[PDB]
Design a binder for this molecule. Structure first.
Ligand SMILES: [Mg+2]
Ligand SMILES: [Mg+2]
Ligand SMILES: [Mg+2]
Ligand SMILES: [Mg+2]
Ligand SMILES: [Mg+2]
Ligand SMILES: [Mg+2]
Ligand SMILES: [Mg+2]
Ligand SMILES: [Mg+2]
Ligand SMILES: [Mg+2]
Ligand SMILES: [Mg+2]
Ligand SMILES: [Mg+2]
Ligand SMILES: [Mg+2]
Ligand SMILES: [Mg+2]
Ligand SMILES: [Mg+2]
Ligand SMILES: [Mg+2]
Ligand SMILES: [Mg+2]
Ligand SMILES: [Mg+2]
Ligand SMILES: [Mg+2]
Ligand SMILES: [Mg+2]
Ligand SMILES: [Mg+2]
Ligand SMILES: [Mg+2]
Ligand SMILES: [Mg+2]
Ligand SMILES: [Mg+2]
Lengths: 110, 117, 103, 141, 55, 48
RNA sequence: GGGGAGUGAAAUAGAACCUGAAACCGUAUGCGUACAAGCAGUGGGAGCCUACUUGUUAGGUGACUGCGUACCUUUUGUAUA
RNA sequence: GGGCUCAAACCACACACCGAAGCUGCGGGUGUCACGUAAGUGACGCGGUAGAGGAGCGUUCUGUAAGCCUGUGAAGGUGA
C-alpha cells in the first residue's frame, strides 16, 4: 500500500523545499530520516515532520513497519503567496511575495 | 444584447495551440507565439509540397546516374537513349529498378545503349 | 512478377495481389478494370520492355473502394500586407487490387 | 514508396588509392564522391552509404601550374592578428596528409553527415597502410 | 544591465544543474548505536565511546 | 404560413457593413478609410 | 497541516468550500539529447517505445538531412540594429 | 568554397542532359459568358495592397416555443 502525508502552506519557497525533497526521493524511510535529521536546511526540519507523519499514518491506519517503508513519492507544490510592500529609495514601492508550498510525502512498502 | 467572448475565444485559442503541439517552449504554450508558429508552419508546408516533387526527382536522377554508370552510361546519355528508343518509363520507376531490380535496369540500359548506336 | 502501368498521369510498379491508391477512376466499387498501358513486364529473368507499350500485355485490377486522402491545409500569408487566406484539400483516390498480370 | 537506405544495412567496401602523380583536385573529387556513396544506386542524402577510401603515397600528389609554391593554406588561431599561412610545398614537407585531407573536406557537406563521411578517409604518407585486415581493393582512377 | 530576452525555462533549469544538495558524512556510535555527524559529538553527548557533555 | 417559415424576398434585406472585424471581411484594420489624412480620422469630414 | 473514521447523492462539495479554463510551477513514464552552430519549423527519414489490427496500422518520440532571417505598424523600401 | 590549367579558363561549332509554382498529364474546386427554360456541357479565366462588389460562419437576446431535449445527466470544462 501507499500512504501519504501533506503539509499545506509550509512557510517556505517551493524552490527551496525542492532541494531537500530531491535528497529523500526513492530512499528507505530510515535513511531518509537520518539525512533530514542532520541537514542544515530549514526545509529538512519541515520535511522531516511530514515524512514521520506519513510513517505514522502507515503504521496506524495501515499497520506497517518502518523498516519496510521507503519514500515512494515526494513532491513540493507551490502554495498561496502573501503580498507585501517594501519601500525603496525614492518613494518607489516594491511588491514582496512571501511564498509558501505544499509538501506531500508518500511512503510505501511494496 | 451583451455578448460575452469567453467561450468562443477559448475555442479559437485552443484550436491554434492544438496545432502547435510538439513545438518548443512558448511556441506550444503561448497563444500569440503559437499563432505565428502555426502560420509559418503552414507557409512552409505549402512551399514544401512544391519542393518535395523537386527533391524526389533529384533523388531519382542521382540514383539513375549511379545505376547507369555501373552499366557504362551517364545519366544524360541514358535519357537520350531512352528517347531514341521510345521508352516512357519515368524516373521514379527507373530509380526503383536501379536499386531493387538491377537485372531489369540493366536490360533497359542496354536498350538505351543500342538505340544510341 | 511485376508490371509497370500508367494510371492517372503517374506510373506504378505493381505485383499480383497488391493494393494501390491511384487517382480517382470513374469505375464503380467492385468492378474490374484492365490497364492496357503497360510499360514493362518482368517475370523474373524475363524482363519485357515496352516501346513504349508491352504488346499484348494486360494488368487486371479490381476497384476496392473510393475515398479521400487526409486533409491538407493550404495557407497563403503575405506579411505586413494584411493578407491571409486559408483553404482545405482532400484528394480523391481509388483503391485498386491487382488481381492479375499477364505478359 | 521510394527506397531509402537504412544505416543498419549499408554495404561498405574498402578501397586503396595511390596518390602518386595524381592531380590533387581531380583525385579529391573521386574520393569525395565515393565517400558520399554517389556511385551507388542506394544513395540517400541523409545516410552515409559510401565506401572507405585509403590513400597512400600522399606526399607524391601534384598540382599543375605554379601552385606548388603559390597555393597557400590559411588558418586563424582566434587571436588578434593570428592569421597563419603555409605553402603547398612546405605543407607537403611537413604534414603531407593534410593536403589531400583539406581538398576532400572542402568537397564534402559541412554538417554531421559530412564529418561522418570524412571519418572514412584514411590518408597515409608511405606506400603502406595499417588496414591490411580490411583487404582494401585497389582503386585507380 | 538587464536581459534583452526573457530567459527560457530550459535555460533557467540548466543553471540550476549545480544546485543539488550534498549529504553529510554520518557515523554510528558503538557505545550507543546512535547516528551522529562524523567527527562530531553525538546528539546524546558521546564521542568515540565516552560521554563528554553529560547533558 | 408559419412564424418560422416567413422570409423577405431575395435582396429585400441585407447585412450592414461591419468594418474592422478582421482580414477576411474585406473591411479590416481601416474600415475602407485608407491610411492617413483627415478623411481617415474620427470626425474627419470635409465641409460641403 | 494532514491520515483514517463518520455525514452527505456527492467531500478532488470541508468552510479561502458550485464549476474550476489559461499563463505559470511540479512528479511519473516513453523516446530524444554532452563534436555541435542561427526565427527552432517544414519536406524527407532511420531507430526505439506503446497498443492492437501484428505490420501497406494507430499513437509518442525523433537520429540524420533539403529548404528556411518572427509578427504588427509604417514606409520607395524592414531579418532589420 | 573546395579546387581547376591538351581546364573545371577563354574563342568557335555540335549533340545531350539538368533546371521554375512556366507548359503538358491526371484528379478536384470556383468565376464569367453561351447552349441549355434542367441535371450539365463548352470556351476562356481564377497573384494581389489601398479600395469597390458578392456570398457566408459563429456568438447573445426575442419569436417560432405552455414546443423539443434534459438527473437514464443541461450549460460549461477537458480528450478522441
Ligand atoms: Mg548547403
Ligand atoms: Mg483587399
Ligand atoms: Mg494607420
Ligand atoms: Mg501619406
Ligand atoms: Mg487619404
Ligand atoms: Mg454512506
Ligand atoms: Mg449547484
Ligand atoms: Mg471548487
Ligand atoms: Mg552526439
Ligand atoms: Mg547553439
Ligand atoms: Mg514526413
Ligand atoms: Mg539552411
Ligand atoms: Mg524612411
Ligand atoms: Mg527584405
Ligand atoms: Mg524589431
Ligand atoms: Mg537583433
Ligand atoms: Mg530535359
Ligand atoms: Mg515542377
Ligand atoms: Mg499554371
Ligand atoms: Mg483539370
Ligand atoms: Mg495566376
Ligand atoms: Mg484573387
Ligand atoms: Mg447561454
Amino acid at each position: 500500500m501507499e500512504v501519504a502525508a501533506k503539509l499545506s502552506g509550509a512557510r517556505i519557497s517551493a524552490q527551496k523545499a525542492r532541494l531537500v525533497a530531491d535528497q529523500i526521493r526513492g530512499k528507505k524511510v530510515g535513511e531518509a530520516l537520518n539525512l533530514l535529521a542532520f541537514s542544515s536546511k530549514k526545509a529538512a526540519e519541515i520535511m522531516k515532520k511530514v515524512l514521520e507523519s506519513a510513517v505514522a499514518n502507515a503504521e496506524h491506519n495501515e499497520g506497517a513497519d518502518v523498516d519496510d517503508l521507503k519514500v515512494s513519492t515526494v513532491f513540493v507544490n507551490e502554495g498561496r503567496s502573501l503580498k507585501r510592500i517594501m519601500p525603496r529609495a525614492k518613494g518607489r514601492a516594491d511588491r514582496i511575495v512571501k511564498r509558501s508550498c505544499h509538501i506531500t510525502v508518500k511512503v510505501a512498502d511494496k | 444584447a451583451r455578448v460575452k467572448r469567453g467561450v468562443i475565444a477559448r475555442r479559437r485559442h485552443k484550436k491554434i495551440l492544438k496545432l502547435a503541439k510538439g513545438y518548443y517552449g512558448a511556441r506550444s504554450r503561448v497563444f500569440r507565439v503559437a499563432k505565428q508558429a502555426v502560420i509559418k508552419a503552414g507557409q512552409y508546408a505549402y512551399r514544401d509540397r512544391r519542393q518535395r516533387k523537386r527533391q524526389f526527382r533529384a533523388l531519382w536522377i542521382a540514383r539513375i546516374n549511379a545505376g547507369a554508370r555501373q552499366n557504362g552510361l551517364s545519366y544524360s546519355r541514358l535519357i537520350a537513349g531512352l528517347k531514341k528508343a521510345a521508352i516512357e518509363i519515368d524516373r521514379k520507376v527507373l530509380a526503383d529498378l536501379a536499386v531493387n531490380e538491377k537485372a531489369a535496369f540493366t536490360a533497359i540500359v542496354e536498350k538505351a545503349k543500342a538505340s544510341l548506336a | 512478377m511485376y508490371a509497370v502501368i500508367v494510371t492517372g498521369g503517374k506510373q506504378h510498379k505493381v505485383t499480383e495481389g497488391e493494393f494501390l491508391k491511384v487517382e480517382k477512376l470513374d469505375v464503380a466499387t467492385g468492378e474490374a478494370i484492365d490497364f492496357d498501358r503497360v510499360l514493362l513486364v518482368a517475370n523474373g529473368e524475363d524482363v519485357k520492355i515496352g516501346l513504349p507499350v508491352v504488346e499484348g500485355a494486360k494488368v487486371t485490377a479490381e476497384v476496392v473502394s473510393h475515398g479521400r486522402h487526409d486533409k491538407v491545409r493550404i495557407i497563403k500569408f503575405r506579411r505586413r500586407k494584411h493578407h491571409m487566406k486559408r483553404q482545405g484539400h482532400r484528394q480523391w483516390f481509388t483503391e485498386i487490387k491487382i488481381t492479375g498480370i499477364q505478359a | 514508396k521510394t527506397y531509402t537506405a537504412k544505416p543498419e544495412t549499408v554495404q561498405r567496401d574498402w578501397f586503396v588509392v595511390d596518390a602518386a602523380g595524381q592531380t590533387l583536385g581531380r583525385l579529391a573529387t573521386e574520393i569525395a564522391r565515393r565517400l558520399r556513396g554517389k556511385h551507388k544506386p542506394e544513395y540517400t542524402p541523409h545516410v552515409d552509404t559510401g565506401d572507405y577510401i585509403v590513400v597512400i603515397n600522399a606526399e607524391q600528389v601534384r598540382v599543375t601550374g605554379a601552385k606548388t609554391t603559390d597555393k597557400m593554406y590559411y588558418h586563424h588561431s582566434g587571436f588578434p592578428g593570428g592569421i597563419k599561412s603555409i605553402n603547398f610545398e612546405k605543407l607537403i614537407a611537413k604534414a603531407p596528409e593534410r593536403v589531400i585531407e583539406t581538398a576532400v573536406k572542402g568537397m564534402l557537406p559541412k554538417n554531421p553527415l559530412g564529418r561522418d563521411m570524412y571519418r572514412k578517409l584514411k590518408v597515409y604518407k608511405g606506400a603502406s597502410h595499417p588496414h591490411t585486415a580490411q583487404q582494401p581493393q585497389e582503386l585507380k582512377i | 544591465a538587464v536581459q534583452q530576452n526573457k530567459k527560457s525555462r530550459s535555460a533557467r533549469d540548466m543553471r540550476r544543474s549545480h544546485d543539488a544538495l550534498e549529504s553529510n558524512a554520518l557515523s554510528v556510535e558503538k557505545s550507543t548505536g546512535e547516528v551522529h555527524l562524523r567527527h562530531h559529538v553525538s546528539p546524546d553527548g558521546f564521542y568515540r565511546g565516552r560521554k563528554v557533555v553529560d547533558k | 404560413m408559419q412564424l418560422n417559415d416567413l422570409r423577405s424576398a431575395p435582396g429585400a434585406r441585407r447585412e450592414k457593413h461591419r468594418p474592422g472585424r478582421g482580414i477576411g471581411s474585406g473591411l479590416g484594420k481601416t474600415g475602407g478609410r485608407g491610411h492617413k489624412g483627415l478623411t481617415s480620422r474620427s470626425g474627419g469630414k470635409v465641409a460641403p
